[PDB]
Amino acid sequence: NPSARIMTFYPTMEEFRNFSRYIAYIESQGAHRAGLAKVVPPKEWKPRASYDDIDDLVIPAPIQQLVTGQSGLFTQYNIQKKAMTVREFRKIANSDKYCTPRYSEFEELERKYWKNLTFNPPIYGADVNGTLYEKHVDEWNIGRLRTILDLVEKESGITIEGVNTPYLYFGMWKTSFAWHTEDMDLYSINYLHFGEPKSWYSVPPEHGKRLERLAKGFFPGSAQSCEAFLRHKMTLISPLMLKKYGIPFDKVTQEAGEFMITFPYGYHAGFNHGFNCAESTNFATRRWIEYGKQAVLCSCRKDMVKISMDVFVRKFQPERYKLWKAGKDNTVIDHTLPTPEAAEFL
Ligand SMILES: O=C(O)CNC(=O)C(=O)O
Ligand code: NI
Ligand SMILES: [Zn+2]
């Protein structure tokens, strides 16, 4: 993947079954270089028999998304609304006020999104603690991926909502996720359970730094008040701005039944097309350990999520533990390099 473009994969069920092993595989094919990959699961795989029974799930903290800005640069402000069922949510999503406009091609819809972003604030059913996987789904169950991320809770008892536990997202048209990498620069997995698509922008990890340097110049206030101000997940930048300032990026549209994977230090943003439901969580491979150790974290206390790297460095990098602890570990990350578990396929 020398061009670092977004790759899509179509595994059989035999290949699908072992999750960490398929991640090692797609990295053996260069997937991680894009920062984002699509995995279309096998036809016979479903995480849930039906979604008919969720009209009464509470969205405890729906968020109205107020967007201020102009000329491709915007900041999103969150207003917490009162708790709402998914049934109340969907009525509002599909009503005339909030529903998806009529469009021909996706490029038309994308245009309307960037034109109308600051108008008619939508509500995002974001960050809902839960899963829509049935108990017995063993393949790619976001509730239990069985990656080395599990060592956090194993060792310490610590669970971090949405990081080592699942989050559900009920979208409506024009609801947004701002530019970010994952907390601790982890991987993420996103499954779109049902509804209208979710569109994604991705910057390759090898160019992530150029993106942060540009964002610092575009929002200099924010930069002086926080090292990692993009971790607040309030910063929207249009693809035309990225392209005007020479940031490589790719785009892709996720459809119901599809998984997206994001990779360590892969900056992504996007928006929902209409009423939908996504489930996501973070995960890790051995390659992530170095990203974790090196992650530039929020210094102003808006983003509190911080994982102790000690257990990972002790277990998987015992040579460098005393050096690392003396603060002498000057390893440079090579973003093109697949995870060690990928040697099997290389
Ligand atoms: O769906 C959303 O709001 C955003 N999802 C992600 O950023 C992810 O899965 O990493
Ligand atoms: Ni993300
Ligand atoms: Zn901060």
Curated annotation (Swiss-Prot):
UniProt GO molecular function: histone demethylase activity; histone H3K36 demethylase activity; histone H3K36me2/H3K36me3 demethylase activity; histone H3K9 demethylase activity; histone H3K9me2/H3K9me3 demethylase activity; histone H4K20me2 reader activity; ubiquitin protein ligase binding; zinc ion binding
Subcellular location: Nucleus
Entry GO CC: chromatin; cytosol; fibrillar center; nucleoplasm; nucleus; pericentric heterochromatin
Outcome of mutating G130A: Abolishes histone demethylase activity
Residue ranges constituting the JmjC domain according to the UniProt record: 134-300
Residues holding Zn(2+): C226, H232, C298, C300
Primary localisation category: nucleus
Tissue-wise expression: Ubiquitous.
Start and end residues of each JmjN domain: 6-48
Residues binding Fe cation, per UniProt: H180, E182, H268
Recorded consequence of changing G162A: Abolishes histone demethylase activity
Modification after translation (UniProt): Ubiquitinated by RNF8 and RNF168 following DNA damage, leading to its degradation. Degradation promotes accessibility of H4K20me2 mark for DNA repair protein TP53BP1, which is then recruited. Also ubiquitinated by the SCF(FBXO22) complex; leading to proteasomal degradation.
Annotated consequence of substituting G125A: Abolishes histone demethylase activity
One of the GO biological process terms: negative regulation of autophagy
Keyword terms, alphabetized: Acetylation, Chromatin regulator, Dioxygenase, Host-virus interaction, Iron, Isopeptide bond, Metal-binding, Nucleus, Oxidoreductase, Phosphoprotein, Repeat, Transcription, Transcription regulation, Ubl conjugation, Zinc, Zinc-finger
Binding site for 2-oxoglutarate: Y124, N190, K198, K233
Subunit annotation: Interacts with histone deacetylase proteins HDAC1, HDAC2 and HDAC3. Interacts with RB and NCOR1. Interacts with VRK1. Interacts with FBXO22; this interaction promotes KDM4A ubiquitination.
Role of this protein: Histone demethylase that specifically demethylates 'Lys-9' and 'Lys-36' residues of histone H3, thereby playing a central role in histone code. Does not demethylate histone H3 'Lys-4', H3 'Lys-27' nor H4 'Lys-20'. Demethylates trimethylated H3 'Lys-9' and H3 'Lys-36' residue, while it has no activity on mono- and dimethylated residues. Demethylation of Lys residue generates formaldehyde and succinate. Participates in transcriptional repression of ASCL2 and E2F-responsive promoters via the recruitment of histone deacetylases and NCOR1, respectively.
Similarity annotation: Belongs to the JHDM3 histone demethylase family.
Free-text comment on this protein's domains from its UniProt entry: The 2 Tudor domains recognize and bind methylated histone H3 'Lys-4' residue (H3K4me). Double Tudor domain has an interdigitated structure and the unusual fold is required for its ability to bind methylated histone tails. Trimethylated H3 'Lys-4' (H3K4me3) is bound in a cage of 3 aromatic residues, 2 of which are from the Tudor domain 2, while the binding specificity is determined by side-chain interactions involving residues from the Tudor domain 1. The Tudor domains are also able to bind trimethylated histone H3 'Lys-9' (H3K9me3), di- and trimethylated H4 'Lys-20' (H4K20me2 and H4K20me3).
Name of this protein: Lysine-specific demethylase 4A
Taxonomy of the source species: Eukaryota, Metazoa, Chordata, Craniata, Vertebrata
